[PDB]
Paper text:
The hypothetical protein Cyc15 was found to catalyse an intramolecular cycloaddition to generate a novel spirotetronate. Cyc15 shares 28 % sequence identity with AbyU and was identified in the draft genome of Streptomyces sp. NL15‐2 K as a hypothetical protein. The overall fold of Cyc15 is analogous to those reported for other spirotetronate cyclases, possessing an eight‐stranded antiparallel β‐barrel fold with (+1) 8 topology. Mechanistic studies indicate that these enzymes accelerate [4+2] cycloadditions via an asynchronous concerted mechanism, consistent with a formal Diels‐Alder reaction.
The structure reveals an asymmetric unit comprising two molecules of Cyc15 (Chain A and Chain B), which form a homodimer. Chain A comprises residues 9–148 of the full‐length polypeptide, with Chain B comprising residues 9–145. The AlphaFold search model aligns well with our experimentally determined crystal structure with a Cα RMSD of 0.47 Å. The Cyc15 dimer interface is populated predominantly by hydrophobic residues, along with a pair of equivalently positioned cysteines (Cys59; one contributed by each monomer) which sit 5 Å apart. Each Cyc15 monomer houses a large, solvent exposed active site cavity, which is sealed at one end by a salt bridge formed between the residues Glu17 and Arg122. Access to this site is regulated via a flexible loop, formed by the β1‐β2 linker (residues Asn25‐Met36), which caps the opposing end of the barrel. In our Cyc15 crystal structure electron density is only observed for the capping loop of Chain A, which is packed tightly against a symmetry partner. As a consequence of this arrangement, the side chain of Glu132 from each copy of Chain A extends into the entrance of the central cavity of a symmetry partner, forcing the recipients capping loop into an ‘open’ conformation. The Cyc15 active site is populated by a combination of hydrophobic and aromatic amino acids consistent with the required local environment for promotion of the [4+2] cycloaddition. Docking studies indicate a mode of substrate binding consistent with the formation of the diastereomer 3, providing a structural explanation for the observed stereochemical output of the Cyc15 catalysed reaction.
Author numbering:
A (entry chain B): 9 to 26, 36 to 64, 72 to 129, 132 to 145
B (entry chain A): 9 to 147
Amino acid sequence: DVVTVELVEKVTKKDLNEGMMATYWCDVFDTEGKHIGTTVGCMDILYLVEHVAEQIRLPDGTIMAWGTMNRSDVLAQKWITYRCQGTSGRYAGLVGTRTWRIQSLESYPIVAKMELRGA
Amino acid sequence: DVVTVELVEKVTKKDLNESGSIEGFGPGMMATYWCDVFDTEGKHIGTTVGCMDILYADPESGHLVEHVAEQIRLPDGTIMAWGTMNRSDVLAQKWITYRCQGTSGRYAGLVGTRTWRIQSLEDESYPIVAKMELRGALE
């Protein structure tokens, strides 16, 4: 049985070291625009190919996600797929995908779709 | 066949959640950080960036259990590391074991462990010794 979560996330903070690297924070909203959690993440630009590892906190548990994105695909508003794994609460033990894209081609909020199930 | 890397890492920047961010909880629930990475001869050779989330308090103790995901950039490649730790163990200067895998360069294709310990709590950069041991994922 799949667990499915649709989110909207907006960046509130980003630090960079200008192989650029970054850390960031996002507000997480449900589809009704209600504020329900937070994402923290880090990024390293491998070759432009970026590699992300992040953690998402939701009212009922926590998830880690990770993956590799081409910068230009993000900017074309293509769907990016990260792998993810529940780390606590309702998501514990579950694995799946976090598929997301820039919602609006400015502040660049994203829509993200998480699907997890037993491993 | 085993690749071993020994580092010292020291925090240079940290941010934690602010009041009002996380409903019902104060700063401390989540963090991002940066560290300077040094070799065993003490030369500055790279950077680590990371994030932390509190999972829960251990009902058997009251101790905080946290989860970390981080990335380390070295002159010859990059590694991703992640894991859960009990903060009691960390502050007691026990050795903490995280999983890690290479993401580029010399470490591409490699998997193993990142075992670390705080070298000093007095030093507000909380220097750690980290020992990474990696082997080929391909059997």
